[PDB]
Symmetry: C3
């Protein structure tokens, strides 16, 4: 699981370290993924650059998760639900201000540790 997090710089920079902890804790609980392998990329953006609907507040945050094919529908749905529940409880970002997107690809589309993902 590679995670990219996008948000307005003034709201996201003060929450970065905590948001990262909460995200990884959810990933580990929902997907049983090693505690060690936190791979997060944060993109604090200016207001001119990150545009969203009038409906949302300045706390509007996008979380993009990429991972190898093969986890169950149940496990992904649980990841989403955990992230909404703990990010609101722990960081105060309401459900309306939070967007989550999971992307998959076959194992041989990945490379790491010197070899293909299908090995």
């Amino acid at each position: 699981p590679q995670v990219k997090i996008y948000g307005l710089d003034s709201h996201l920079n003060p929450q970065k370290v905590r948001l990262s902890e909460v995200i990884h804790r959810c990933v580990v609980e929902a997907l049983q993924f090693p505690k060690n392998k936190r791979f997060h990329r944060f993109f604090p953006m200016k207001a001119e650059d990150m545009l969203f609907s009038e409906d949302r507040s300045s706390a509007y945050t996008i979380i993009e998760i990429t991972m190898m094919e093969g986890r169950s529908k149940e496990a992904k749905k649980k990841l989403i639900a955990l992230l909404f529940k703990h990010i609101e409880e722990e960081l105060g970002i309401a459900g309306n201000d939070l967007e989550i997107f999971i992307q998959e690809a076959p194992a041989y589309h990945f490379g790491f540790r010197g070899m293909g993902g299908d090995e």
Copy 2:
């Protein structure tokens, strides 16, 4: 849909307010999406960081669109053609200098407004 737009800072920064309006106009027109749900992220790059082929002018722009699976092939194809037509017309960006990429995923791959995309 979620839209990300990449281009050279010096070309993209003066055009971004009107590029965003035009992109959304095409999204509304081809996908019957609500006029209110405009979700755009711009990424003006330094010239050292965006490298393209000599076949492209400094206007070269990349538009990446992510949406839930389910739309027809014909609607997605309409969205592409409309974006080419109207960005040419409204902004002067020729078709050779514009690249568009659509990405889909199942609905349960999305979370928004506190519930999954289902």
Copy 3:
């Protein structure tokens, strides 16, 4: 193909001209692409913004490749292998510090040069 390259600023900025060369060489070799058609976007990142596991070093680099569907698995695996080999030889980025991700979509999901990708 479209290529995005992420890495910590202190490592990526000095190396991105050579890394762009080496990447393009491997793409042309594994996919018989033209020697033109190099499309590369670099994202030199702050270490507060690109977090990775403790066993990785500051040379940790992510290469994201977007391409039209239709290439064989053998060609995509060759591309992965060539990138691990030539980037390690040319820039000294060890296999554990290099991560590669290919993403595909139907040809009609693309536009370039004013036409749809399936035209």
